[PDB]
Amino acid sequence: MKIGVIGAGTMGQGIAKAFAQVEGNTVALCDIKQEWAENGLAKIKKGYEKLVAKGKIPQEKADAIVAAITPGLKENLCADCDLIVEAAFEDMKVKQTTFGELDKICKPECIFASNTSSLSITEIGKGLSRPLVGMHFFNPADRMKLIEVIAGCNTPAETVEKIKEISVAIGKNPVQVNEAAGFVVNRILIPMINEAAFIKMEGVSDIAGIDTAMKLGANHPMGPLELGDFIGLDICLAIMDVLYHETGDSKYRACPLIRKMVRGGNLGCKTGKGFYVYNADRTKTPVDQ
Amino acid sequence: MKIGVIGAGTMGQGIAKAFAQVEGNTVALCDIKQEWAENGLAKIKKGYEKLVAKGKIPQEKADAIVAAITPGLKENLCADCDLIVEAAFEDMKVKQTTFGELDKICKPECIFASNTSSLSITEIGKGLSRPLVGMHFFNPADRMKLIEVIAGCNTPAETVEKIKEISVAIGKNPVQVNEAAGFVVNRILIPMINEAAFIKMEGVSDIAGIDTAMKLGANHPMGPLELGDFIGLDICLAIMDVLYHETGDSKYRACPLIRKMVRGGNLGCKTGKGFYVYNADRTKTPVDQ
Amino acid sequence: MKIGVIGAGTMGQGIAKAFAQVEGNTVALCDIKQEWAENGLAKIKKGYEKLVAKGKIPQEKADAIVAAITPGLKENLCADCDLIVEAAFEDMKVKQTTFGELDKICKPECIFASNTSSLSITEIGKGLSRPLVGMHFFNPADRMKLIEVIAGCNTPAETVEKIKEISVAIGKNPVQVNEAAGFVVNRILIPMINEAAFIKMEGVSDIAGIDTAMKLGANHPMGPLELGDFIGLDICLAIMDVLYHETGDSKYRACPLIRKMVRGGNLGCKTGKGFYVYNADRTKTPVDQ
Amino acid sequence: MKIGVIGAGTMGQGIAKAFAQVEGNTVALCDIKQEWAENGLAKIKKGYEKLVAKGKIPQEKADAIVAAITPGLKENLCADCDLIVEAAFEDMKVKQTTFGELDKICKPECIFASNTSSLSITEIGKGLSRPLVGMHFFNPADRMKLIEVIAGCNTPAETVEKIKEISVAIGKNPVQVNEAAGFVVNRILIPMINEAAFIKMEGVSDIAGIDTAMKLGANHPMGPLELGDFIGLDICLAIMDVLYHETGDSKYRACPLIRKMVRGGNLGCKTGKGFYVYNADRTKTPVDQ
Amino acid sequence: MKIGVIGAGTMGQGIAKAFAQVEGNTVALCDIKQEWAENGLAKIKKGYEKLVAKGKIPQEKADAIVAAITPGLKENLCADCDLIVEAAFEDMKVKQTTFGELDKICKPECIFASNTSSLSITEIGKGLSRPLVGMHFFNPADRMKLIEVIAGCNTPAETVEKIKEISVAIGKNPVQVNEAAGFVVNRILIPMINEAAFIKMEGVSDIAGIDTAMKLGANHPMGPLELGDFIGLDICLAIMDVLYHETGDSKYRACPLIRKMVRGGNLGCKTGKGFYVYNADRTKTPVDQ
Amino acid sequence: MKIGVIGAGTMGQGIAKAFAQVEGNTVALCDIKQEWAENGLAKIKKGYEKLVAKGKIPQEKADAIVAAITPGLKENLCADCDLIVEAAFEDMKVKQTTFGELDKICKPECIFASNTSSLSITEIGKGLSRPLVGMHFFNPADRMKLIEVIAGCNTPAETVEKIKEISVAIGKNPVQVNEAAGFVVNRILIPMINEAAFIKMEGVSDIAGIDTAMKLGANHPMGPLELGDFIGLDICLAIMDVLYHETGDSKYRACPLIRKMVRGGNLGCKTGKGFYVYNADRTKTPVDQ
Ligand SMILES: NC(=O)c1ccc[n+]([C@@H]2O[C@H](COP(=O)([O-])OP(=O)(O)OC[C@H]3O[C@@H](n4cnc5c(N)ncnc54)[C@H](O)[C@@H]3O)[C@@H](O)[C@H]2O)c1
Ligand SMILES: NC(=O)c1ccc[n+]([C@@H]2O[C@H](COP(=O)([O-])OP(=O)(O)OC[C@H]3O[C@@H](n4cnc5c(N)ncnc54)[C@H](O)[C@@H]3O)[C@@H](O)[C@H]2O)c1
Ligand SMILES: NC(=O)c1ccc[n+]([C@@H]2O[C@H](COP(=O)([O-])OP(=O)(O)OC[C@H]3O[C@@H](n4cnc5c(N)ncnc54)[C@H](O)[C@@H]3O)[C@@H](O)[C@H]2O)c1
Ligand SMILES: NC(=O)c1ccc[n+]([C@@H]2O[C@H](COP(=O)([O-])OP(=O)(O)OC[C@H]3O[C@@H](n4cnc5c(N)ncnc54)[C@H](O)[C@@H]3O)[C@@H](O)[C@H]2O)c1
Ligand SMILES: NC(=O)c1ccc[n+]([C@@H]2O[C@H](COP(=O)([O-])OP(=O)(O)OC[C@H]3O[C@@H](n4cnc5c(N)ncnc54)[C@H](O)[C@@H]3O)[C@@H](O)[C@H]2O)c1
Ligand SMILES: NC(=O)c1ccc[n+]([C@@H]2O[C@H](COP(=O)([O-])OP(=O)(O)OC[C@H]3O[C@@H](n4cnc5c(N)ncnc54)[C@H](O)[C@@H]3O)[C@@H](O)[C@H]2O)c1
């Protein structure tokens, strides 16, 4: 009911879908400007009718979700609608600038969670009139079932359990984690991608060989270079850079190959080229040749 | 072709099975003592008709397979083989002595391959005449389809691809690796386990929560703390120390909590207690609770 | 001699008292506004009125010390001063703005000194027409006998000696420091407290355990965690980051637990909460239980 | 109760005094040879007569304290003892074989404790039939009030509790320390001295300056360089090496200046030259001038 | 060939001379306005005549190289160019916008190039209509023969080879560099200078000794401490910090002594004082006595 | 003056040549066995068929150099030597024993010098009746004109000044060094080669391009990879390890490529294969093609 999704990108669309999938949620997909928001809802819709083509979901529910999602600026969001899940740029200032009113133009009745993957939950919510909590999704947010619950330094446990019940009543498994850089999943998962980059940069193996070896030798559903393309390399570099800045530990130095690629605009799937090139045939070719 | 397997342990049997399921590839499964190569051999037979008993093999092959493997010790079986996949104690001097002995035994066109994980392939065959290559199987070597081919500093390109051709001929998917500590799999997988222990020691979450987070948010079949008990925490601590000694990079410094548990005999599954207590009724209780 | 103390705060007051406590030393206590300056003086007087009523100083000298301190702002009273000791905000351009403005106001023979602890003496006085030196007092400056004489890159040895002589002229012991981060005391004392936070965060011991251990085993007047809240965790955090940034050495990486508390506004005694909760009944409870 | 003190050295003598100081406590002071155990008792009795002649302890109690300590060998005396504190050479295999001996001579209900400060108490007692705990006394043990209770990986919470009861009973303050290198005091105090050496090596300040800065700017009873000369630079270097090897963290790297002095035999007070030259005139002169 | 050299500073003048030293070459020397753009040509002409005065080039060629250069503004002169080489302020946003203009002023087949020492070629050319490549010159650019060719993340192999051909066509030896921090020379040379400062700061050897040790022990033409002053200590400090920030590796931490000198304006030859005081008599004197 | 050079290897012969080519210098080239002492003199006199068959020197003085070097072993020749220069195996245990009896054999006014590049001068001369000082030559000692005078902990400055006196007498340039790992040249030069290896391993540039870039870009007479092969990659790897284990800083970690090549016996010029393949035709070829 009146769920607030700020950010209409890779995962704002997934959280919008994950909430609008169930009974009634009437979800609010907002972005920087109006057309970028409906561009994200259009991608949600084209996916939904590409998924009735293969008959994995009926046609009536596909638009019941798309019609429950209202695109736009924060002008449908900020009528004190409900619990709000920010999915904006992985940058401390932008995550706290927007939250300067998502507590305010909403009634302080509401719950203000952030889907940040490494940032400090406490510093995001440093001056708002009500707690800021962390609800952490994983892409695709409609398929994956884990929700990382992160309590702020002085965030009351009232907010933490009311959001644990929200995820339970959506088919998700809530697990509470104490606030630290990259919490639990990303602090373990992202350096795996960072290490595969180092392995390729230092000529240990090729791109396809790194991803095959992690899939057959460790039974992983996707290799780390594949996984970095799916997440988005700009996000991967931002998470690695937060871990380094917070800890001061060179254990988390981002591999220079990834920063070179992110500077080149090759962020993976969302840009059409990562460690692999994404051809129109829905096929995937390693950049190594 | 005839293949020797120096060592009849977990990897000695596993590799022998992978070399027995196809054709007139006769394996000489050796060990230090004949009492044990048959012990080894006896263990493989039991697991076969553990599964002949389950309508999934015909025993006409589960017998032609076990008949192809002949047990003994190196000198009285290994004069007429074309490939030696040694899998012995992970010690630099036992493998150097071994290949120093088999060099004066085997055919002068028999290929010498090592199944080591943490030792330098180049240093193994430094005193030998014929090239030494890396052939890294994965537990269990019968069904695991990945083989890391390790090219040493002086491993000719010819030797590498013949191992790559033997690997495809036995259904395995090979990958070429230029010698570096932890090649690909263990260089990514083991620091992942190491980072999970840092999560626990720093109190970011509990043992169960870390494991469940990694199978629900990253789709991993086993949790990292789970896997560390399976592989063996002594094996993981040794690999982290190899990566740290080889590179000098404090990025691969082993977690002090893991070093504490190894000195306590709590090596995981093979000792009854690891990160989880392995009770008699098979319940897996985290030592945290 | 006449001395101009720029800044009428905690250290400006203590430095004004340290100089006027002598005899031929008169002080010019300056601040942002005049009312903010004679504010600082009014508190210096109230202190000396209490020290009189306890029988630990006569009234006639408490009168004489206060009579030697004249409030106001600079430009009006710092033209004849022989020594300038700034006690302004820990901000580079603030001290640069201030020292450049006094460069025209003070007579050529006026020595310029700064009280900073984390800012580079050499950089503060870059464009100044005269040398700049460091005079590091320790709170409370009127009773603490140590003064660090910080020599800059272009601080002439003679300027160093004139600070040495004035320091002995007021009963203090001057210790010369060649400009480095954390000079001598902070570079040793703050990584001490920083180590205590790492010990607590990694579950080595409890808060009450660490502090009483450091005062019983090392005979220290205060535990490090206690001392952290007393100096202010924001101050200790900024010092570690200055150490880390200047040297680039991960040895001085700030403990994430301290950075978490500073984000939550828990800075210690000055906010009621720290490693200890400073209760209204003036007791002090470890936050561990 | 009866307390077997193993090792009649500096710490064993003080620990024997710290126990025989209480009324109902009997001490067995053992060593390698019987005569060596009696020489240690002769020295504590000598220090007691020097205390009676100075009127700080009546002659009645010194004779009672001395009569509670009986020297000898491991088997003859330690059979019927309730607690065992070992104070032997800081050698992993020395302490390992000693506790294995007592595991067959000491009664089952006897408690096994070690005075080690650099070795892993988990590893010390890995093969014993009973738990091991750490009881880290402080020199001089007869008047130092701290006791560090070291809980290993398999030290039960019950054993930690009874060690704290005995410590409170003999007038000491227990502090539970979960096993980590340098526990609490040494992990904080030794890097402090190590930092002071770095400050001198980099020419920040001279020797006497650093020490007087720490006693006047931090209210410490002794300067860090002074403290190292009193502890012994060989031990301070050994501690830093343990911290560096157990963590793998460049943060705990020893100052090369210290290692150069240790190689030169300038270990401080016990050699007559450290950071200070210790003349026969009871004076102390820094190497700097 | 027509070459547009954007930036009339120290390297812009030399790079313009390296191209006009050859014969079918026209050079446009651009700046922000036109006066200082013609000034840059005036500094060149004055440098050129002092060579004809000593007898090192005839007036026939000195004037002819001057005539091949045209000062002015970018739009007026660069629409008909075949190569662009920017030598502007080492600032990422500045270089990003000038190539945005040139992307629509220059003809389709014109080749862009950047002389940057410390900024990512990939990022400079993120959204251009044509590839961006690095052409690193070395000061003095008209006689030094090395030209580092930097391949960005998206720089085609063809455009790099065209730059290679342009290098030999003007008398230079090109070397291909896949973009990394410091490319090749600065990544090796600057940490060499940095290490010399570390050797000095820690009291290993004197300034005069370190230099003579490197020129006589390694047969270098200059010592590392005098080379740093020749380059400029601010330049060297900026290279070490870009290396440190790009790699996140503490291996490239800048020597605090170099940082202190830059803050004090002791930048080397260009300021008359570095590790050596460059004298009236044009002879150098170490600051070490 | 008469000198005793202990050792007949490359540096033993080289220091013997460097001394015997002045005039009043007589050398006692002592080794472990006489026959190998005449070995060194033979290689000296064999190579000296390239100074008179080249006729630079007249055999009036071209055998007065080979006549000044007298073979034999230690105890029979060094009873009255003016200076001792050991060049034995780079092993701490061997050198102390060597100087241990030279102490009793040589006259009291004999100066003890050592040529070690990695071992600690202070530790070698700990238990001696006279100070030991470092005299570090550079291969080839006859042509290289630098001498690193290494002052140990207990080495007097007076003893340093006479090593400087002797160095000028033989035409060399002494530089005083205070004992530190890798002194000055190796601390700067070997990390150069180490960084060049990292550049190759990380795919930044090829072996040939890296070398010409350092020759043409920094005016170095040799490339850094070239110099590693010339110095010997085993000695280069040993220095980095010595630099790493002494400082404890991961700044000095050895490149894994170098460690790989050393394990493969590809040490450079003295084995025929390094970073270049050294042809008998006196040319070389990079291993990159
Ligand atoms: N990429 C992942 O797999 C995932 C992992 C878990 C956490 N999330 C977190 O979600 C956040 C969003 O990143 P993403 O993965 O969706 O990639 P993304 O960059 O494509 O999505 C970001 C979206 O937010 C929009 N946006 C930016 N600023 C905004 C503002 N002020 N107001 C409204 N909208 C704004 C952007 O236009 C963009 O559409 C990240 O910060 C990340 O921490 C990332
Ligand atoms: N999952 C794993 O354990 C992992 C997987 C990849 C490869 N690695 C490597 O494979 C190799 C085999 O290890 P494992 O898992 O089988 O442990 P293991 O101890 O069970 O196997 C050792 C076997 O080799 C025998 N052996 C020892 N020395 C011998 C000798 N000199 N000659 C002949 N036989 C000898 C032993 O008797 C024993 O049977 C190891 O080097 C290991 O590093 C194992
Ligand atoms: N125990 C300590 O507080 C510690 C001790 C050593 C020195 N340091 C340094 O001493 C200096 C004094 O800090 P503080 O502890 O007194 O905090 P404070 O806030 O109490 O003192 C700051 C005072 O300086 C005034 N001020 C600001 N700008 C001014 C200006 N341009 N001209 C005149 N006055 C100005 C402010 O109005 C304020 O009253 C700081 O730089 C601090 O880093 C303080
Ligand atoms: N200031 C300190 O001395 C410091 C304080 C904290 C604890 N530590 C630890 O205390 C323990 C002892 O320190 P110390 O200074 O007294 O050593 P020490 O050299 O002064 O004397 C040790 C005594 O133990 C005896 N001993 C050795 N092995 C023995 C054995 N197998 N059986 C019986 N006796 C044996 C020795 O004969 C010797 O008398 C060490 O583990 C040390 O790390 C000492
Ligand atoms: N020896 C060296 O200094 C070193 C050598 C190799 C290359 N690097 C790189 O060369 C480049 C230039 O270095 P420099 O020595 O000339 O410093 P510089 O400051 O002297 O050059 C700046 C010149 O370029 C002009 N300029 C600035 N912005 C401009 C713009 N937007 N358009 C046109 N002109 C502009 C300025 O007016 C000025 O004349 C830098 O990127 C530097 O990193 C310099
Ligand atoms: N580029 C270099 O070679 C480098 C340069 C500076 C000095 N260093 C140091 O110079 C010393 C000599 O180096 P090297 O290359 O000539 O070694 P080497 O391998 O050439 O042989 C060492 C020589 O010393 C002899 N020797 C060994 N032990 C002896 C002993 N106990 N008594 C007498 N003679 C003994 C040996 O017989 C042999 O002749 C080493 O310590 C080395 O680290 C060498």
Residues of F with CB under 8 A from a CB of D: 120, 122-123, 126, 152-154, 179-181, 246-250
**E122/A266 touch (CB, cutoff 8 Å), yes or no:** no
A164 and A77 housed in the same domain:
yes
Task: Check residue C168 and report its DSSP letter.
Answer: H
Q: Compute the C-alpha angle C161/C162/C167, nearest 5°.
A: 95
Which phi and psi angles does C284 have, rounded to 5°?
-150, 115
Report the atom number in ligand 6 closest to the C-alpha of F90.
41
From A177, A202, A229, the end of a domain falls on A177
Between vectors from CA B143 to CA B138 and to CA B145, what angle results, nearest 5°? Answer: 60
SS3 B100: helix
* CATH code for position C203: 1.10.1040.10
What is the enclosing helix (H) or strand (E) of E133?
strand E132-136
CA pair distance B218, B200, nearest whole angstrom:
18
Inter-residue contact E33 to E77 (CB < 8 Å): no
Q: Which amino acid belongs to residue C176?
A: Q
Output the six-digit token pair for B75: 């000198």
Q: Are residues D174 and D207 in the same domain?
A: no
> Could you please report the per-residue DSSP string of chain F?
-EEEEE--SHHHHHHHHHHHTSSS-EEEEEBSSHHHHHHHHHHHHHHGGGTTTTTSS-HHHHSTTTTTEE--BGGGTGGG-SEEEE---S-HHHHHHHHHHHHHHS-TTPEEEE--SSS-HHHHTTT-SS-EEEEE--SSTTT--EEEEEE-TT--HHHHHHHHHHHHHTT-EEEEEES-TTTTHHHHHHHHHHHHHHHHHTTSS-HHHHHHHHHHHH--SS-HHHHHHHH-HHHHHHHHHHHHHHH--GGGPPPHHHHHHHHTT--STTTSBSSEEE-TTS-EEETT-
DSSP string for residues in chain D: -EEEEE--SHHHHHHHHHHHTSTT-EEEEE-SSHHHHHHHHHHHHHHHHHHHTTTSS-HHHHHHHHHTEEEE-HHHHHTT-SEEEE---S-HHHHHHHHHHHHHHS-TT-EEEE--SSS-HHHHTSS-SS--EEEE--SSTTT--EEEEEE-TT--HHHHHHHHHHHHHTT-EEEEEES-TTTTHHHHHHHHHHHHHHHHHTTSS-HHHHHHHHHHHS--SS-HHHHHHHH-HHHHHHHHHHHHHHH--GGGPPPHHHHHHHHTT--BTTTTBSSEE--TTS--EETT-
HSE at residue A167, side-chain half, CA atoms within 13 A, is 25
How do beta strands F69-70 and B276-278 pair? unpaired
For an interface test with D, give the residue of C144, C160, C205 to mutate (most D CBs within 10 A): C205
Which residue is listed with tokens 């940095």?
E194
Dist. CA F217–CA E189, nearest whole Å: 10
Q: Which long-range contacts (CB under 8 A, 24 or more apart) does F88-95 make?
A: F88/F6, F88/F7, F90/F116, F90/F117, F90/F118, F90/F119, F90/F238, F91/F119, F92/F119, F92/F120, F92/F123, F92/F124, F95/F119, F95/F124
Tokens 């200790």 locate to C236
Domain annotation covers residue A208: yes
Q: Are residues E139 and E92 in the same domain?
A: yes
B25, B114, B117, B194: which is the annotated catalytic residue? Answer: B117
User: How far apart are the C-alpha atoms of F32 and F43, rounded to whole Å?
Assistant: 17
Atom of ligand 5 nearest to the CA of E235: 3
Rounded CA separation E110/E112 (Å): 7
Out of A153, A249, A250, the one facing C263 most closely (by C-beta) is A153
Q: From the CB of C8, is ligand 3 less than 6 Å away?
A: yes
Same domain, C142 and C191: no
What residues contact residue F231 under an 8 Å CB cut-off, 6+ apart? Answer: F139, F193, F268
Helix (H, G, I), strand (E, B) or coil at C278: strand
Domain range for F168 is 2-178
Phi, psi for F148 (deg, rounded to 5): -95, 105
How many A from CA of B92 to the centre of ligand 2?
13
E176 forms bridges with which residues in the sheet? E149
**The dihedral formed by the CA atoms of A97, A98, A102 and A103, expressed in degrees to the nearest 10:** -10
Of residues E114, E118, E120, E136, which has the active-site annotation? E136
CATH number of the domain residue D152 falls in? 3.40.50.720
The answer to whether C153 and C179 have CB atoms below 8 angstroms apart is yes
Report the alpha-carbon distance of residue C70 to residue C16 in Å, rounded: 10
B112 and B237 assigned to the same domain? no
Tell me the C-alpha distance between D272 and D114, whole Å.
Answer: 31
Which residue among D39, D115, D233 is best mutated to probe the pocket of ligand 4, counting the most ligand atoms within 8 A of its Cβ?
A: D115
How far from A16 is each of A2, A49, A117, A164, CA to CA, in Å?
A: 11, 17, 17, 18
Residue D90 CB contacts under 8 Å (≥ 6 apart), including other chains: D116, D117, D118, D119
DSSP string, A48-73: HHHHHHTTSS-HHHHHHHHHH-EEES
- From CA C19, how far away is CA F214, in angstroms rounded? 60
Structure solved using which method?
X-ray
> Which token pair is D109?
């209900």
Q: How far apart are CA E182 and CA D227, in angstroms?
A: 45
Same domain for A148 and A23, yes or no, is yes
Ligand 6 pocket by Cβ (under 6 Å): F 6-12, 31-32, 36, 87-90, 94, 98, 115-117, 136-139, 231
**Residue from D6, D11, D148 whose mutation best tests the ligand 4 pocket (most atoms within 8 A of CB):** D11
CA of C202 to the centre of ligand 4 (A): 29
In the three-class reduction of DSSP (H, G, I as helix; E, B as strand; rest coil), residue E113 is classed as strand
What CA–CA distances, in Å, run from D117 to B257, D83, D124, D235, D242?
18, 19, 12, 11, 10
Distance F190 CA to ligand 6 centre (A): 19
Residue of C nearest to D209 (CA): C175
Instruction: Give residues with Cβ within 8 angstroms of E18, minimum separation 6.
Output: E137, E141, E142, E170, E172
Tokens of B148: 């890391």
Q: Are residues C115 and C135 in contact, defined by beta-carbon separation less than 8 angstroms?
A: yes
Residues C85, C147: one domain? yes
Sign of CA dihedral A57, A60, A65, A66: positive
What ligand 3 atom has the least distance to the C-alpha of C88? 24
CA-nearest of E152, E123, E141, E150 to E13 is: E141
Angle, CA of C43, C47 and C50, to the nearest 5°:
140
Contact predicate B87/B37, CB 8 Å? no
Contact call for residues D187 and C192 (beta carbons, < 8 A): no
Task: Return the best residue to mutate from F6, F11, F231, F269 for the ligand 6 pocket (most ligand atoms within 8 A of CB).
Answer: F11
Is A289 exposed, middle or buried (CB count within 10 Å of its CB: 0-12, 13-18, 19+)? exposed
Which of D131, D157, D178 is the C-terminal boundary of a domain? D178
Per-residue burial over F182-211, b = 16 or more CB atoms within 10 Å of its CB, e = otherwise: bbbbbbbbbbbbbbbbbbbbbebbbbbbbb
Candidates D145, D139, D114; CA nearest to D231 is D139
- D270-273 long-range Cβ contacts below 8 angstroms, 24+ apart: D270/D232
**Quick one: E62 and E117 in the same domain?**
yes
Residue type, F283: T
Same domain, yes or no, for D60 and D161?
Answer: yes
Extended beta strands in chain C, E state: 2-6, 26-30, 69-70, 83-86, 111-114, 133-136, 146-151, 173-178, 276-278, 284-286
Structure's resolution in angstroms:
2.5
| Of E25, E117, E167, E194, catalytic | E117
Q: Relative to the CA of C97, which ligand 3 atom is closest?
A: 31
Catalytic residue (one of C186, C194, C226, C266): C186
Q: Which residues line ligand 4 (CB under 6 A)?
A: D 6-12, 30-32, 36, 87-90, 94, 98, 115-118, 137, 139
Strands F111-114 and F83-86, by their bridges, are parallel
Between CA D120 and CA D112 the distance in angstroms is 14
Span between the terminal Cα atoms of chain F, in Å = 53
Alpha carbon separation from A192 to A227, B194, B216, C24, F154 (Å, rounded): 10, 12, 17, 69, 51
Residues forming beta bridges with residue B285, ordered by sequence position = B277
Q: Can you spell out the DSSP letters for B126-143?
A: SS-SS-EEEEE--SSTTT
**Residues A194, A132 share a domain:** no
Q: Token pair for residue C116?
A: 């900073």
Cis ω before A140 (30° cut-off from 0): yes
Half-sphere exposure of B127 (CA within 13 A, CB side): 12
Counting Cα atoms < 13 Å in the Cβ hemisphere of F262 gives: 18
CA distances to A190, D26, D85, D159, E124 from D104, rounded to whole Å, are: 52, 21, 16, 20, 75
How remote is the CA of residue B116 from the centroid of ligand 2, in Å?
Answer: 8
Q: Are strands E83-86 and E111-114 parallel, antiparallel or unpaired?
A: parallel
Q: How many CB pairs below 8 Å do chains D and E form together?
A: 9
SS3 A16: helix
Half-sphere exposure of B89 (CA within 13 A, CB side): 9
How many angstroms separate the CA atoms of E247 and B63, rounded?
Answer: 58
Going from the C-alpha of D80 to that of each of D97, D108, F223, the distances in angstroms are 20, 10, 74
**Cβ atoms within 10 Å, residue D164:** 18
Distance from the Cα of F258 to chain D's closest Cα (Å) equals: 22
B128 Cβ contact list (under 8 Å, min separation 6):
B99, B100, B103, B112
Q: How many residues does chain C have?
A: 289
Q: Per the annotation, does C109 bind a ligand? A: no
Assigned token pair, A269: 């799937």
Say if CB C130 and CB C109 are below 8 A apart: no
Give the Å distance between the CA of C31 and the centre of ligand 3: 9
Contact assignment for B217 to A191 by CB distance below 8 Å: no
If asked whether residues E114 and E171 sit together in one domain, one would say yes
Contact F148, F123 (CB under 8 A): no
Separation in Å, CA F33 to CA A80, F2, F71, F99? 95, 21, 10, 17
Q: State the nearest Cα–Cα gap between C204 and chain B, in angstroms.
A: 9
Among residues A153, A177, A201, the one where a domain terminates is A177
**Binding-site residue set of E for NAD(+):** 8, 10-11, 31, 74, 88-90, 95, 98, 115, 117, 231, 270
- Residue E175 sits at φ, ψ, to 5 deg, of -135, 130
Q: Is the CB of C34 under 6 A from ligand 3?
A: no
Same domain membership, residue A141 and residue A10: yes
Q: Which two tokens stand for residue D274?
A: 């450290």
Distance, in Å, from the CA atom of B186 to the CA atom of B117, rounded to the nearest integer, reads: 8
Q: How far is CA C17 from CA A120, C39, C150, E178, in A?
A: 43, 14, 22, 63
- Counting the structural domains of chain F, the total is 2
Q: What residue type is assigned to position C270 of the chain?
A: K
| Angle at alpha carbon of residue E148, lines to E143 and E149, rounded to 5° | 130
Q: Chains with ≥3 Cβ pairs under 8 A against B?
A: A, C, D, F
Concatenate the DSSP letters of all residues of B220-277 into one string: -SS-HHHHHHHH-HHHHHHHHHHHHHHH--GGGPPPHHHHHHHTTT--BGGGTBSSEE
Task: List the beta bridge partners of residue E2.
Answer: E26
Disruptive mutation site among F199, F202, F250 for chain A (greatest number of A CBs within 10 Å): F202
Contact B219, B206 (CB under 8 A): no
Which of D191-226 are b and which e, b meaning 16 or more Cβ less than 10 Å from the residue's Cβ?
A: bbbbbbbbbbbbebbbbbbbbbbbbbbbebebbbbb
* Helix (H), strand (E) at residue E231: helix E224-231
